[PDB]
Each structure stands twice: as structure tokens, then as C-alpha cells.
Design a protein around this ligand. Structure first.
Ligand SMILES: CCCCCC/C=C\CCCCCCCC(=O)O
Length: 133
């Protein structure tokens, strides 16, 4: 999963609105989030990670150690317990709360595929790399 490092910008999205409805995001915030073109900046040092997700209206920042449970507050404001692990090509962010959700990221054919799963909803968001320097 080491190649997730760098900067990424959203290229395509499928079923994000239903994902947000399932986790309880309100109407106005869904309007903003659906229209957004977020960037993700991912840094990796050994088993230490950070991920900054930026939009014009909201930024989230998390930092963690692979395998170590930590407190996360999501962009929409849910308090959850998160554990991240590496599974070959993918880094999986397993979120416990109300509701639970699974977020996976992996690079394929040069693009970061982020799959978000909650209850019976699956959302796929594909990011293109932004070259740094
Ligand atoms: C900075 C990101 C905040 C986006 C607005 C908050 C609304 C919904 C958040 C749902 C959980 C996080 C989804 C992340 C999707 C993605 O990174 O493309």
C-alpha cells in the first residue's frame, strides 16, 4: 500500500449520496459534499500514516499507526473508533460507531480507488494522482 503516498484529486464517484444518507449526513452538507472535488494528501513513514482530505468548505486530518485503534471524527462530525491495516496492495480503514463503515484505498492502474461501505451501500470514488514537484 506504500504507493498511496502523495497527492490525489477526485475524478469519478458512484453512489456517494446513498453512502452519506446511510451515515446520516444532512441535506445541506450532502449538497456541498456531492459537488466537491476533494484532494487527499497521504504521507507514510514506516507504519505511520497521515491523510489530509481537503475541500472548499471542510478539511479532515488524521494520523495513525497501522494496527493501532484511534479516535476519529469524520468530516460530517461522527465520532468513531478507527483501526487501519495493510492488506497487500490496499490500506483498509475500519470504522466502528453508529453506523460502522469500511473504507479501503488502493492504487490500480495509477489511480486510487477508494471504496466506502456502510450497511448495504457500496460507494466507489476514483482519484487521479497530482504530481508533486
Ligand atoms: C474533507 C471531507 C469532508 C467532506 C464533507 C463531509 C461529508 C461526508 C463525509 C462522509 C465520510 C467521509 C467520506 C470521504 C470521501 C472521500 O474522501 O472522497
Amino acid at each position: 500500500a506504500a504507493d498511496l503516498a502523495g497527492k490525489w484529486i477526485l475524478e469519478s464517484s458512484e453512489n456517494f449520496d446513498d453512502y452519506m444518507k446511510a451515515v446520516g449526513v444532512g441535506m445541506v452538507m450532502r449538497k456541498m459534499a456531492n459537488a466537491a472535488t476533494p484532494t487527499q494528501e497521504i504521507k507514510i513513514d514506516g507504519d505511520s500514516w497521515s491523510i489530509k482530505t481537503s475541500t472548499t468548505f471542510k478539511t479532515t486530518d488524521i494520523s495513525f499507526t497501522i494496527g493501532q485503534e484511534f479516535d476519529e471524527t469524520t468530516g460530517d462530525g461522527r465520532k468513531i473508533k478507527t483501526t487501519c491495516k495493510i492488506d497487500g496492495n490496499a490500506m483498509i480503514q475500519d470504522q466502528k460507531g453508529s453506523p460502522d463503515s469500511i473504507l479501503s484505498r488502493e492504487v490500480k492502474d495509477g489511480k486510487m480507488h477508494m471504496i466506502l461501505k456502510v450497511n448495504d451501500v457500496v460507494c466507489t470514488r476514483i482519484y487521479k494522482r497530482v504530481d508533486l514537484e
